[PDB]
Every structure is written in structure tokens, then in C-alpha cells.
Symmetry: C3
Subunit: 263 residues, 3 copies
């Protein structure tokens, strides 16, 4: 089970590393993996046309259940995951074997739970609640990959302070007027009562991605920067009583483009 998972991770790396060497004139050693969430596939446009980026379809990569994009962004070599529990984070581990990536930048679309948030706002993630992981669906469940990281991983330090300071500094410099908050992302696998529960539980934004990748990247020792696009404000007010009578993506693109040059 872990033996087969290890072999598939090594096969994926083996394949990827070979394709890089055949494609690039110099060693390609990406400093970051960028995961483009829903509606944010335009991050790819920010990849320079020279040298010609390398594109591998997931179908072609051993053990990948979409495409991987290898190229330069603002002078830095990166990999983009265009589209996306053990198997869902397999790509992170396969890419870790390249031995160059030290930052995961992950973007997603999320529902606004914090009452201050409005659609179109951004939220830099500085904490998370991994609801399925508290219960029994967890990317690290099973035998530990001892070569990658520890059996018991702290997550109180999951969201790098310097990367967050960097993101905000870059926003003020490109003078982006879009609202950006800092808060807690809750991962779940939506009623008024459930949204109310999420709010009182401490949720600022909610969605069904990101956290398993953040946990897996942290397990590998990477730094993590995570950014949510608030697509809508969830309603928390009770139903009526029977007794009664893509502008965002553009901004995300430029933020990330700026960020990676200092990564």
C-alpha cells in the first residue's frame, strides 16, 4: 500500500525529470508549485513564452488520477498545476523529489462566511480548520512516509508569515484596490444553519480544496502561501417562520506574478 504508493511517486518523478531534461537546455529546478483553483487558470498566461514551457497532461504521468506546466514566471522557474486523499496529493510528493521546490502557492474559490466579506474580495489564508481530517479522511492517514516528513506534523505554523507579508506588500505596490482580508479557511467535503455553524466555529471562508495540499506540502517541509477568492457571501439568517407575515483572477495573477520574483 505505501510500497506501491512510493513506487508510483518514484515513477512519476522518473517520468517528469526525464521530460524536463529533454525539454530544457539548462537544468530546470522549479522554486515553487502554483496550484490554480477554479476560475484562476489564467495564472498560466503569466508563464513566459521563452524558453518554451513544458506541458504534461496528467493522463501521461504515472499514477496521476488537467496538466502540469513547467516554465518561467517573472524570472523564476515554477510548476503550475492546472486543475486538481493520498492520491490527490501524490503530485506534491512526486514533485518534491525534484529537490528544488520550497514553496506551495495555492489559490481557490471559496464561500464567504465572515460577515465582513463581500463577493470579489480576496482572503489570504493564515489558518485552517480541516474538518474531514479531524474525523477520519486525512491525507497523512496510513503508514508515514518517513523519507518525506514526521509521523506527527504540527499545523500551528502552516502559513508562513513572511510570504503573507510579501503578498500584502505587493498589493500595496501595484496599488490593487481589491479588498484583501486575512483569515481562516475551513475545508469541508449549504444550509443557513450550517453556514451559521461554520461562522461560530471560527470559519472566515469555506471550500472543498486546498487544505489536503497544504498539509502534504508542510509534511514535505515546504513553505505555504494560500489565497482564496470569495465568490459569494453565504447566508446565515434563519428561513422564514411559518408564523411570519473574472476581474478577480487578473488581480490574483498579478499578485502571484509579483510574489514569485521574491520567492
Amino acid at each position: 500500500d505505501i510500497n506501491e504508493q512510493r513506487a508510483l511517486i518514484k515513477s512519476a518523478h522518473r517520468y517528469i525529470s526525464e521530460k524536463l531534461e529533454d525539454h530544457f537546455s539548462s537544468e530546470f529546478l522549479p522554486k515553487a508549485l502554483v496550484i490554480c483553483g477554479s476560475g484562476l487558470s489564467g495564472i498560466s498566461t503569466k508563464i513566459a513564452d521563452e524558453p518554451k514551457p513544458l506541458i504534461l497532461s496528467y493522463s501521461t504521468i504515472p499514477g496521476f488520477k488537467g496538466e502540469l506546466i513547467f516554465g518561467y514566471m517573472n524570472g523564476a522557474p515554477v510548476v503550475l498545476m492546472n486543475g486538481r486523499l493520498a492520491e490527490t496529493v501524490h503530485p506534491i510528493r512526486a514533485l518534491h523529489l525534484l529537490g528544488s521546490i520550497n514553496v506551495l502557492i495555492v489559490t481557490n474559490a471559496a464561500g464567504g462566511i465572515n460577515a465582513s466579506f463581500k463577493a470579489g474580495d480576496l482572503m489570504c489564508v493564515y489558518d485552517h480548520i480541516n474538518f474531514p481530517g479531524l474525523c477520519g479522511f486525512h491525507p497523512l492517514r496510513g503508514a508515514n512516509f518517513d523519507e518525506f516528513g514526521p509521523r506527527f506534523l504540527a499545523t500551528s505554523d502552516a502559513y508562513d508569515l513572511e510570504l503573507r507579508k510579501l503578498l500584502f506588500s505587493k498589493k500595496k505596490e501595484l496599488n490593487i484596490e481589491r479588498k484583501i482580508h486575512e483569515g481562516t479557511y475551513s475545508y469541508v467535503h449549504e444550509s443557513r444553519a450550517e453556514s451559521r455553524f461554520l461562522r461560530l466555529a471560527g470559519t472566515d471562508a469555506v471550500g472543498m480544496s486546498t487544505v489536503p495540499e497544504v498539509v502534504t506540502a508542510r509534511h514535505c517541509g515546504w513553505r505555504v502561501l494560500a489565497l482564496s477568492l470569495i465568490t459569494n457571501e453565504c447566508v446565515v439568517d434563519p428561513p422564514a417562520s411559518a408564523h411570519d407575515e473574472a476581474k478577480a483572477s487578473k488581480d490574483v495573477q498579478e499578485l502571484i506574478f509579483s510574489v514569485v520574483a521574491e520567492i
Copy 2:
């Protein structure tokens, strides 16, 4: 399948029972199962040399799964502690290792069939969520939160073992009052100064330590200490009709403050105070002698 689970339970029992009958000259009828938590395997040193104890490796008993952790694979130790026949589970299984909850509590079912055990004494290490707790303190468990259980991961899911207990088990009475009073009486008798709080333990799956927001969530939900075991064993023992005494060692203080903000002028490093397994083990080791002596005293009076 339940008829498959019954067969595995009956098989484990038969193996264990036959081992005992061949090892001890008097019928061995343990009154308590003691489950030893992280860093507390020292409890086994309280088993007397005479009569010779019996040690059964998990790897040799049907249905038992071994730890994925080397080389602590886990063993059942049958012997006399302070004159009382007991069985110790030296090592427990955790669901984060990849075992089903049913697998982690199978030994309780198998041992129930000996027909003598009426008390579970369960120990564990836990992170302190209650702000007043400090590493080194003990907490006597008088209540729990089974959040994974509410959400679909429950050791009693499936056809009910009607031979053992009710389809619908109350848990508002899970933590016997007289055993908790016994525990505190022994603290007094032994002049142990270590604090023993009383409070609520929450089971979470792991294997990550909790984020700040998760810990804040557990806190607002009423958690005093958090760990990755114990609750499914308690529930299963209760299903079998045993009384339960549960004792947590607070091995670390969960970090619950919001992380440094990007806007903060003098930020606290987000790594400050982070939990590590090494801190848990070293703190378990420091408190082990007190835990050993408390249990040694308790088993003579059950």
C-alpha cells in the same frame, strides 16, 4: 461482516483462553483491562514477577492488528499487579495508522469473552485545550466529545453485537463516579502532589497536531484536552457493560492564539510553542512514575 467479526472475536478469545489455561495453575480471571498510552509503557513494570506473567504479542493473536510503529508492535500482558489479576494492553492501535475503528477496539471484545473483566482503565497523552492546564498535569476524564462519531466514524457502526450490549448506548453516564473518587483517594493516600484536574477529553483522528483554529474550535465546543485515541475504547467497553476510569496526561499546551498577522509590528513567530512528538514522549516519561503508582493502587480496590 458481523458473522465474520464474531468468528474473529471468538477465535481471538479461544487462543487467549487456551494460552492462559496452560500458563497459570489457577484460573486467570483479570478484573481490569489497563490500556497504556504514549510514553506510559512503564506501567508494565508494576506486574509482579510471581506468578510468572504471560506475554502475548499482537502479531500472534487472531484479529489483532499490530502497530505500524516500530518496534513497539504491541502486546497483551497477563499478570498480577498489587495482587490483582489484570491484563495490560501495552500499546494501542490508532485509526490514523490506517486501522478501522472496529479493528482498534477488537481486543476489548475478545477480552470481554473471558467473562471476568468489569473495568477499563485507559491512559493517554493529550494536548491541553483548557487554558489553566499545564504540561505535567493529569486530567481525570469525566466526559468526552466524539466529534468523529457524530460525523460518521463510530466504533459501533454496523449490525449490533446483541450478545454484548444494546443497539443504543447512552454516554451521559460513561465515566463511573466511584472510580474517579477512588483515583483521587489514591492520590491522597500516596501523597502525590501532581495536579489531577477533572474534565472533558475530545477524540480527533490525527495524525497532525491541531492548528490554532482547530484548537479554538475544540475549546469553544467544550474540550479540556484533545487526543487521538481513547474515546472509541471507552464507548466499546461501555457497550460491553464495563465501568471505565480514564486518565489523561497533559503533555503539551495546545497553541490557540491567532498566528501573527501580516499587519503586526512586532510579530510572535508562528513556530513558537509548536507541538512535537519528542515533547509528548519526554513529558510522558516525567509523569510515568506517578501514573504507575496511581494505577497500581487503584487495581487493588476494584
Copy 3:
């Protein structure tokens, strides 16, 4: 699995549809499905004698893991589910809602009326009160357990108008039902948690049926019978010299069944009145 799940649902519909054709002289097209929860089998007595109702045991219907009763109630053609399935029994959520998906294929049902027993979490509720459900919290759904605006306002108003018309004194609250997996009754700390989470009543069923009915395009009316008041007080401390016994007030299935049966006549009268205006 999925293109085969579809086959089992069609197989169930074929079985049922032919049994109905064989049984009734005129086309029988039920407009409501009533799911009879814990201790509420008495609904069956409200089915009229003429035309004779058809009973189908769950054991003879393809894919069903109880009985289905097809007949007229207060002039309305309905189906009753006498017995429901629960995830704590080891059944997948898909298996627990299979009967709804099969019956949807008749193309005639447009209302689910679902009843259940529930523990009272709201401090003001008493055993014997009813609660009309207007919202829910799906706890297993947080982890992705899933069978595949929910609770019709006009049906809720209809329920209250019938309580008034029938002079039923029994209290009917309106509030939030929390679905938790079971099969244990909640600990004191768990019940206090549910209360702070916004729960008014707690139970181990219903939500997956509601979600499935909505997916099939049906309106939903859900009624909980409060059968017991959940214990919330912290248990006796070892330091208390005058402790309240930890067993005091504990939930039992016996209490649930007895209290379900006591409220059953009122619930039957309500549902009987409602289906005629569905």
C-alpha cells in the same frame, strides 16, 4: 457502480409499478410519500379500506435493504414507508434513500412528509412536544457522507393551520434538526456542543432523505417528535459530597419508543389532514 446503481433503481421501479398495475383497478399514482419514523407505524391505520391497500415487504423489492404501503388516505393516494434505514446500521447513505429514488420513477409524487423521533437540545423543549423542521445541520455531510430552501414554507404553514383547525393542544416548535450518525446517545458535552452550534433537536436520520427528495424535485415537510430532553449538565465531580448520580435522566430506546407512541395519535391526525391539501 453508477450506471449499475441506476439499474437497481429501475429494477425497483419496475417491480413496484407492476405490482401496482396488478393490484389496483384504476391507475394508482401516489402524490405523497410518508416516511414513518420511530414508533410511528400507526400512520398505517389512516389508510382507507376501499380500495384495498397494497403492502410490499422491503425484502421482496429489488435493492431495498419494513414495508411499503400504497393506498388512499383522506382521499389522497399516498405511499407510506413503514420503516426507514439508518446509516448507523452499516448501510450506505445511498442504500438508505434507494426507496425514494425508486418511487420518484413513478413520476407522480411531489411531496415528502417525513417524521422522526429526536432528542430535545433547545432548553425550552419538553418530551412530548413536536418540532416542525425548518433547517438542518448535516454533520456526516461535513466529511462527505452523502446520499447522492429545503423545508417548504407553505407546507409548514399548512401544518400549523391544521393544528389550529384540529384543536391539537400539543406544542409544535419550529427549528433546526441536527443529523448525527449514532448509534450512541449524545454525551453531556456533545449535547452542549450541539446547542451552541444552533441545534434545536438531534436525531440520526431524515436529512439524507430530505436532500434526496429535494434532488428529485419534491417539496418536503419534516416533523420531529421530541421524545426525551438531552442531558447537558456536567456530570458529578469526584469532589462533590452531594453528587447527582450520573445515570439520572439518561436516554434509552425504551423511553424513545414509549414517547413516540404517546404523540402518535396527534401526529397521525395532522398528517391525515395535511395530505388532503397537498
